[PDB]
Ligand binder design. Structure first.
Ligand SMILES: CN1CCN(c2ccc(OCc3ccccc3)c(C(=O)Nc3cccnc3)c2)CC1
Length: 259
């Protein structure tokens, strides 16, 4: 009833495919999961909670054997990853726009008590007018329910995007962790390279940054205004790390750059 036409990439669990309807030629994206059930139950539940202009749309789901099918709005612009030119990044106004939209999507998810846990360019996709959409909720989980915050006690994500505390701490707050990874995405956008393999005490590039060696790459490619915001995001202490309301007050964030 659908034709798997091309493989888009790997989602959290399984694969996601471009599928085009046999009857109507509707272009759609499908995640195929060969059936865990609690985890699939969880992911599906969270998907139906979502309604926002910078989050991907969810359609529905169907099982054959222990295969589950989840359909989502196809991202006709492809991925943000493809717009990052290696070693160079992208123009500053394109990066600021994408950043603005990312914070809106992140503000929305935190307002409903959801954390994505794997913000990085491959999970940030584009529609036809190039607006950013946050995709894939296989690692997402609840951090606030009936007004009470739950700390996270489990490691996940992608090492170059993960906050240091998630490697060193038994438990930690969800929100500052999404804020870190948003700064590594802004870094990638403005420089076309990632700052370190992982934010760990044995990683020499991360040590270089803590001691403020911003005469080195990638920092030397970034203008002093965006650099000053990155100074507040990539802070080791999660309690002193800038929060999203304050990111909205940052100089570069409110700088006019784009027609
Ligand atoms: C002509 N263009 C070329 C570029 N096109 C394109 C390229 C990559 C994509 O995702 C890679 C991916 C991202 C995350 C995880 C695995 C794989 C998607 C896409 O829409 N995927 C998607 C949508 C909704 C939910 N999940 C994934 C669409 C669309 C057609």
């Amino acid at each position: 009833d659908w034709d798997l036409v091309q493989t888009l990439g790997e989602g959290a669990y399984g694969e996601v495919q471009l599928a085009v309807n046999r009857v109507t030629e509707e272009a759609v994206a499908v995640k195929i999961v060969d059936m865990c059930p609690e985890n699939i139950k969880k992911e599906i539940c969270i998907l139906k909670m979502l309604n926002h202009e910078n989050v991907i749309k969810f359609y529905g789901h169907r099982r054959e054997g222990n295969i589950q099918y989840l359909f989502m709005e196809l991202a006709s612009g492809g991925s943000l990853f493809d717009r990052i030119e290696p070693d160079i990044g992208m123009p500053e106004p394109d990066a600021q726009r994408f950043f603005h939209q990312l914070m809106a999507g992140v503000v929305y998810l935190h307002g409903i008590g959801i954390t994505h846990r794997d913000i990085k360019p491959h999970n940030l996709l584009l529609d036809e007018r190039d607006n950013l959409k946050i995709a894939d909720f296989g690692l997402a989980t609840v951090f606030r329910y009936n007004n009470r915050e739950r700390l996270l006690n489990k490691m996940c994500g992608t090492l170059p995007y993960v906050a240091p505390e998630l490697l060193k701490r038994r438990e930690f707050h969800a929100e500052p962790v999404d804020v870190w990874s948003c700064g590594i995405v802004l870094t990638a956008m403005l420089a076309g390279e990632l700052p370190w393999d992982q934010p760990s005490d044995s990683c020499q590039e991360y040590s270089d940054w803590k001691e403020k060696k911003t005469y080195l790459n990638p920092w030397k490619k970034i203008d002093s205004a965006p650099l000053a915001l990155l100074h507040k995001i990539l802070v080791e202490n999660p309690s002193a790390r800038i929060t999203i309301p304050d990111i909205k007050k940052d100089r570069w964030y409110n700088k006019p750059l784009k027609k």
